[PDB]
């Protein structure tokens, strides 16, 4: 998983913020791995 990678490297508050601005975008963290990085 490209999504799983992202959990390790990035801290709490960015992980949180990243998914938020990703649902706004219209897509879930799973469907887009490289775009979540």
TrEMBL record:
Protein name: Polymerase acidic protein
Subunit structure: Influenza RNA polymerase is composed of three subunits: PB1, PB2 and PA.
Family note: Belongs to the influenza viruses PA family.
Lineage: Viruses, Riboviria, Orthornavirae, Negarnaviricota, Polyploviricotina
Part of the whole protein covered: 1 to 36 of 713
Source organism: Influenza A virus (A/little yellow-shouldered bat/Guatemala/060/2010(H17N10))
């Amino acid at each position: 998983s490209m999504e799983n990678f992202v959990r390790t490297n990035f801290n709490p508050m960015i992980l949180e913020r990243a998914e938020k601005t990703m649902k706004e975008y219209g897509e879930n963290p799973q469907n887009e791995g490289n775009k979540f990085a």
